[PDB]
JSON list of C-alpha atoms in Angstrom, two decimals:
[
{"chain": "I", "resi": 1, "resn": "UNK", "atom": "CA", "xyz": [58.15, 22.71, 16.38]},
{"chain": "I", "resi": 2, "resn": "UNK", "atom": "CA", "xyz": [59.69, 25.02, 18.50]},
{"chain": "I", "resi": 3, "resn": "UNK", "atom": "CA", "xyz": [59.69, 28.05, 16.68]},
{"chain": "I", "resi": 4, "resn": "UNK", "atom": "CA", "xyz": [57.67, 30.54, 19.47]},
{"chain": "I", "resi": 5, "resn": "UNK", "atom": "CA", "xyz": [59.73, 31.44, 21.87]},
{"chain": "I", "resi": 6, "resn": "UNK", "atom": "CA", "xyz": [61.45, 34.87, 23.43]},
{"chain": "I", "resi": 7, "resn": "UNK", "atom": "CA", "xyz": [63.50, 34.75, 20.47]},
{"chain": "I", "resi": 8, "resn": "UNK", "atom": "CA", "xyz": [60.96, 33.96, 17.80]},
{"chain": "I", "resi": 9, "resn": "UNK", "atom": "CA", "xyz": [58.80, 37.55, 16.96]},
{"chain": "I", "resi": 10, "resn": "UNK", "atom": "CA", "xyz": [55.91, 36.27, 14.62]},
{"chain": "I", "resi": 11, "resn": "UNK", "atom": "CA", "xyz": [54.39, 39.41, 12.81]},
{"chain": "I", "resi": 12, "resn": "UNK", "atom": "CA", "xyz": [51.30, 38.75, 10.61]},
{"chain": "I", "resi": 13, "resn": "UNK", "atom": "CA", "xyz": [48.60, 41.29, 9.02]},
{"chain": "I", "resi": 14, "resn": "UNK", "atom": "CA", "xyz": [45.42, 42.75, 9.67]},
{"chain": "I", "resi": 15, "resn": "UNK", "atom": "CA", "xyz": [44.41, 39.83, 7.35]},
{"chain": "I", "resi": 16, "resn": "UNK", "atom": "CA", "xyz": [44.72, 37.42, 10.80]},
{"chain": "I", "resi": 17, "resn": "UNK", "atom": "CA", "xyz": [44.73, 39.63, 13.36]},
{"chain": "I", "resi": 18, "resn": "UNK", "atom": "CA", "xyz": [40.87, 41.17, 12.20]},
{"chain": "I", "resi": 19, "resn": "UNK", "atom": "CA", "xyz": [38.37, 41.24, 14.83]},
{"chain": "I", "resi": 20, "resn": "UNK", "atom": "CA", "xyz": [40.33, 41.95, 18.04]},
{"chain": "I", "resi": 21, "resn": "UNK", "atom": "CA", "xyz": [37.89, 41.07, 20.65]},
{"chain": "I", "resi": 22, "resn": "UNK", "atom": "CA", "xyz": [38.33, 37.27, 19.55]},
{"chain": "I", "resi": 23, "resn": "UNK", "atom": "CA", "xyz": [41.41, 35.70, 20.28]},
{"chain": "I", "resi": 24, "resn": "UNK", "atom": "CA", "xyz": [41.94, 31.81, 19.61]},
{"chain": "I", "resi": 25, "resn": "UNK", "atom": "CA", "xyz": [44.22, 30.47, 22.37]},
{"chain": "I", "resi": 26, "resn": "UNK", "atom": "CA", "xyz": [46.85, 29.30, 20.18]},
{"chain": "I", "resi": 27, "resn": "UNK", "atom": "CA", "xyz": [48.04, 32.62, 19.23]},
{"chain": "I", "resi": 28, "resn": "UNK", "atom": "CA", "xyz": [51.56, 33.21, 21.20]},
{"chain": "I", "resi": 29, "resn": "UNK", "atom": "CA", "xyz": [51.95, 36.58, 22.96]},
{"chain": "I", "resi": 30, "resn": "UNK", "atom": "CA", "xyz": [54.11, 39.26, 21.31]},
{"chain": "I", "resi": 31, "resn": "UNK", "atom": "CA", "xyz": [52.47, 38.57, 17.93]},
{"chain": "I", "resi": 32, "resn": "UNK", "atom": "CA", "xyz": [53.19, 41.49, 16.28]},
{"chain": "I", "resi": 33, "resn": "UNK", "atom": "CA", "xyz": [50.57, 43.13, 13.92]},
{"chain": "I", "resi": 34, "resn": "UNK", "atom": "CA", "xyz": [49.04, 45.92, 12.03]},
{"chain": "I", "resi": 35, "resn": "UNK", "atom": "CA", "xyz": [45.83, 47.18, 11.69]},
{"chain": "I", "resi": 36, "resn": "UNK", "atom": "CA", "xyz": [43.12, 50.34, 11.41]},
{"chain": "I", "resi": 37, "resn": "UNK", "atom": "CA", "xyz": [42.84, 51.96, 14.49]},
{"chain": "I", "resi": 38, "resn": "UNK", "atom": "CA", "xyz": [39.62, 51.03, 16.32]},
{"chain": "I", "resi": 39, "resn": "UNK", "atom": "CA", "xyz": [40.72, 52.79, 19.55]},
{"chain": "I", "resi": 40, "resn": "UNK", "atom": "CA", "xyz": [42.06, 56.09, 19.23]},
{"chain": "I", "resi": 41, "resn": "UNK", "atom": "CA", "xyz": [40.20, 56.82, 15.83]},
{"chain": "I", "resi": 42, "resn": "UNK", "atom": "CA", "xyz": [36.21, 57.05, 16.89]},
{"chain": "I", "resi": 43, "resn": "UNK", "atom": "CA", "xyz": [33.17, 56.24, 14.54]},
{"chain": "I", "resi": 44, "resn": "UNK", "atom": "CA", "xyz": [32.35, 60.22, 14.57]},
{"chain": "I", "resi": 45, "resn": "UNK", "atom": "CA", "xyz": [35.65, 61.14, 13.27]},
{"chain": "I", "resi": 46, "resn": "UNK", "atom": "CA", "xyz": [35.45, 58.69, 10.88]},
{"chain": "I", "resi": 47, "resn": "UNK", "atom": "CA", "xyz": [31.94, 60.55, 9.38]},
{"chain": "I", "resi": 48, "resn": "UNK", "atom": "CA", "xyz": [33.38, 63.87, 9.66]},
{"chain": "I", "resi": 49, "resn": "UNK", "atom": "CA", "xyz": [36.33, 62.85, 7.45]},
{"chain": "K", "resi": 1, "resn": "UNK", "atom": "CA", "xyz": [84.47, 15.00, 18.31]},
{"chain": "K", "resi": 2, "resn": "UNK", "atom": "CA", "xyz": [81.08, 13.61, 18.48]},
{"chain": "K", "resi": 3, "resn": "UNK", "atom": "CA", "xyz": [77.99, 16.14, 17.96]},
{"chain": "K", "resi": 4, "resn": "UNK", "atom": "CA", "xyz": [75.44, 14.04, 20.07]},
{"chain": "K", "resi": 5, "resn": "UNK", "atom": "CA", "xyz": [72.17, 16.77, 20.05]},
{"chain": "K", "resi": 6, "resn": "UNK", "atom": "CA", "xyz": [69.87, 14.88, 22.37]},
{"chain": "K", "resi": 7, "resn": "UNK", "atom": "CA", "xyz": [68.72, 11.70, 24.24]},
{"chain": "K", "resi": 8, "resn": "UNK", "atom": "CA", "xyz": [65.05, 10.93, 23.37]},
{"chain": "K", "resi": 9, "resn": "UNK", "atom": "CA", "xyz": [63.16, 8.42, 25.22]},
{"chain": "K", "resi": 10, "resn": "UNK", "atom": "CA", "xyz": [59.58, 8.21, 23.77]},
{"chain": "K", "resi": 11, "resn": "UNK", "atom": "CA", "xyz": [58.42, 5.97, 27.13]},
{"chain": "K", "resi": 12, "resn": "UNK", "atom": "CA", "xyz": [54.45, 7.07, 26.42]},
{"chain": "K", "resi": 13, "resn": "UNK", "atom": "CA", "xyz": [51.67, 6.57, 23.69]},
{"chain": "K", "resi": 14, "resn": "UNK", "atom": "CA", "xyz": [53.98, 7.59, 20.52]},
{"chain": "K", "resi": 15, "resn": "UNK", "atom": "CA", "xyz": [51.09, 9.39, 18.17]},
{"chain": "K", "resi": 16, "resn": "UNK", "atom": "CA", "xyz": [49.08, 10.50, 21.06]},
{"chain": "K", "resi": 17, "resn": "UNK", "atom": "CA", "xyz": [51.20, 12.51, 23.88]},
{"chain": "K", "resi": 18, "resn": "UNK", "atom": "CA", "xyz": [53.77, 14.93, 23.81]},
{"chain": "K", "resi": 19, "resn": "UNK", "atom": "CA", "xyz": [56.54, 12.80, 22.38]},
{"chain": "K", "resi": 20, "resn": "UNK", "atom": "CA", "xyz": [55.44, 13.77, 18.57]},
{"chain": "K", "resi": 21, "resn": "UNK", "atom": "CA", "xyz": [57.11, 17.61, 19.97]},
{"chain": "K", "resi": 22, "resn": "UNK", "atom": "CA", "xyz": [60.32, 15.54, 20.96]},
{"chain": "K", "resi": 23, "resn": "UNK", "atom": "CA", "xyz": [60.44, 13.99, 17.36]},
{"chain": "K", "resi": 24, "resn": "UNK", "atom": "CA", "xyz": [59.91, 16.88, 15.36]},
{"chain": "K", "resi": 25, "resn": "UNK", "atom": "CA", "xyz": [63.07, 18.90, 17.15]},
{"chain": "K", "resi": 26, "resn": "UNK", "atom": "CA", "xyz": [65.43, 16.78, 15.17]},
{"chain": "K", "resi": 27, "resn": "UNK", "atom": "CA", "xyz": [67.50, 17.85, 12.63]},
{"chain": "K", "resi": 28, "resn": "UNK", "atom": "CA", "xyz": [69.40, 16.32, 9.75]},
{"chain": "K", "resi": 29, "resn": "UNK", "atom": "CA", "xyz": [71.58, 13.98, 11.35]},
{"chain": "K", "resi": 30, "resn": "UNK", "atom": "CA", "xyz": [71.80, 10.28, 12.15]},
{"chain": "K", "resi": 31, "resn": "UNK", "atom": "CA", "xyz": [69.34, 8.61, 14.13]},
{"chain": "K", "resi": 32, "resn": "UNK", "atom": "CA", "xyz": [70.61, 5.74, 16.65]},
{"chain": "K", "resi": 33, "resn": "UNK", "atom": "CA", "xyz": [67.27, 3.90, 17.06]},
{"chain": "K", "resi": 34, "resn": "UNK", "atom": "CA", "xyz": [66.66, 1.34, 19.36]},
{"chain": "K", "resi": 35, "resn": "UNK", "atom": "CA", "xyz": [63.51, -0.46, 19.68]},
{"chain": "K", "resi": 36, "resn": "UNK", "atom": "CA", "xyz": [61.71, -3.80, 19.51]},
{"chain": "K", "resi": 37, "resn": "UNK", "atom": "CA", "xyz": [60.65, -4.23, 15.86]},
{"chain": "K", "resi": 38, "resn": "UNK", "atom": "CA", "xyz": [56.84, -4.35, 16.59]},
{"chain": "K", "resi": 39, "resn": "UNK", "atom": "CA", "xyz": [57.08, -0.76, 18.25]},
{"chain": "K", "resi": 40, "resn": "UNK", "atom": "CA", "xyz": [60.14, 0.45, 16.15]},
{"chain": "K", "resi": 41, "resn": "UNK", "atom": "CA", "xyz": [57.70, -0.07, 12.63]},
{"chain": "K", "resi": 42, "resn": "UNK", "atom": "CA", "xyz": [55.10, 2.80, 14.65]},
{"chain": "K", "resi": 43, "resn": "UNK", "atom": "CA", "xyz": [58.21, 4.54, 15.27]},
{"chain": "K", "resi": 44, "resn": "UNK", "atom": "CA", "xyz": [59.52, 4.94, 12.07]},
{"chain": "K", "resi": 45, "resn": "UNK", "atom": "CA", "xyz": [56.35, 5.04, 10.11]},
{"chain": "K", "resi": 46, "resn": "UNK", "atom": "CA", "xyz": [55.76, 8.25, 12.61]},
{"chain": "K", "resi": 47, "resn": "UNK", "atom": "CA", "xyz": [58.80, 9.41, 11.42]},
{"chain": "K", "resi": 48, "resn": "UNK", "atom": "CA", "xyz": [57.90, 9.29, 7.96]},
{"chain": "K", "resi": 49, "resn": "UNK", "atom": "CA", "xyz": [54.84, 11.20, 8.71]}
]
């Protein structure tokens, strides 16, 4: 429909954006989203907390 | 002071290529169609859908 674009900035939730080492093709680049840190935020900080 | 938005020729398959993407950027306006009858029944019946 033409609604992704440089001037379109879809932002969606962790609801869609869950599981970031899958990525269907149709998602346009510069989708904005937020979610738990998986990166910076390691599994043994997450027991000592 | 004409607003004439685009010239679409839909020359290819109507409900199988690209031209569905040409057909869904129009807008609320009037639509000069011109077409033999056989062809322009697909076409509006696409339109519809």
């Amino acid at each position: 429909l033409g609604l992704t674009g440089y001037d379109f900035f879809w932002i969606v939730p962790s609801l869609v954006s869950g599981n970031t080492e899958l990525i269907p093709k149709e998602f346009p680049s510069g989708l904005i989203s937020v979610s738990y840190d998986d990166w910076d935020y390691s599994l043994e900080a997450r027991v000592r907390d | 002071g004409w607003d004439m938005q685009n010239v679409i020729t839909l020359d290819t398959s109507f409900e199988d290529a690209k031209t569905q993407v040409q057909l869904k950027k129009i807008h609320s306006s009037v639509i000069l169609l011109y077409c033999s009858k056989d062809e322009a029944v697909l076409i509006l019946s696409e339109a519809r859908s």
